[PDB]
């Protein structure tokens, strides 16, 4: 460097939101935050990581889409703003 | 937040359209709305989820492309507008 402040606020937002969104459903149903590969990486494959017994996490998947929606808008607003 | 209205209209449009498009063919041929991964996720793999006996759903796949076409235009018009 001797030879990011705007992003610094941004990276905190995803990190804060990922902790919140993850605690909402990812922990509800080591860490499992590997699902934050918004660019690409792994897909969805429903929600089956550990203790995949039928629970109310199905409705949380809709909220997961809601979380995905704002994440797309979050980067769009800042990167293109 | 103490430390989206335009998107709110948008997310309703996809949700309304997904219910309509899904009821059109996805339910015609638990839920199967996981096919709405427009960004990436799972591909198509034809149409074989449950009761894959030969039916008129083949023509609905063309309508599925038609549905895909407007979904691409739906986000393009709003996000870039």
UniProtKB/Swiss-Prot annotation, chains A, B:
Tissue: Abundantly expressed in CNS. Widely expressed at low levels. Detected in dorsal root ganglion (at protein level). Expressed in the keratinocyte layers of the outer root sheath and, to lesser extent, to the matrix of the hair follicles (at protein level).
Record text on subunit structure and interactions: Homotetramer. May convert from a homotetramer to a homopentamer to allow pore dilation. Interacts with TRPV1; may form a heteromeric channel with TRPV1. Interacts with SNX11; this interaction promotes TRPV3 trafficking from the cell membrane to lysosome for degradation.
Highest rank taxon of the organism: Eukaryota
Family recorded in the similarity comment: Belongs to the transient receptor (TC 1.A.4) family. TrpV subfamily. TRPV3 sub-subfamily.
Sequence ranges on the Cytoplasmic membrane side: 2-3
Name of protein: Transient receptor potential cation channel subfamily V member 3
Species in which this protein is naturally found: Homo sapiens (Human)
Binding sites annotated in the UniProt record for Na(+): 41
Intramembrane region coordinates: 30-49
TM region positions: 4-28, 53-81
Gene coding for it: TRPV3
């Amino acid at each position: 460097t001797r030879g990011l402040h705007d992003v610094l606020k941004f990276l905190f937002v995803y990190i804060v939101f990922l902790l919140g969104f993850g605690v909402a459903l990812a922990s509800l149903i080591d860490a499992v935050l590997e699902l934050f590969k918004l660019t690409i990486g792994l897909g969805d494959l429903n929600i089956q990581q550990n203790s995949k017994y039928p629970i109310l996490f199905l409705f949380l998947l809709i909220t997961y889409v809601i979380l995905t929606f704002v994440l797309l808008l979050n980067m769009l607003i800042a990167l293109m703003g």
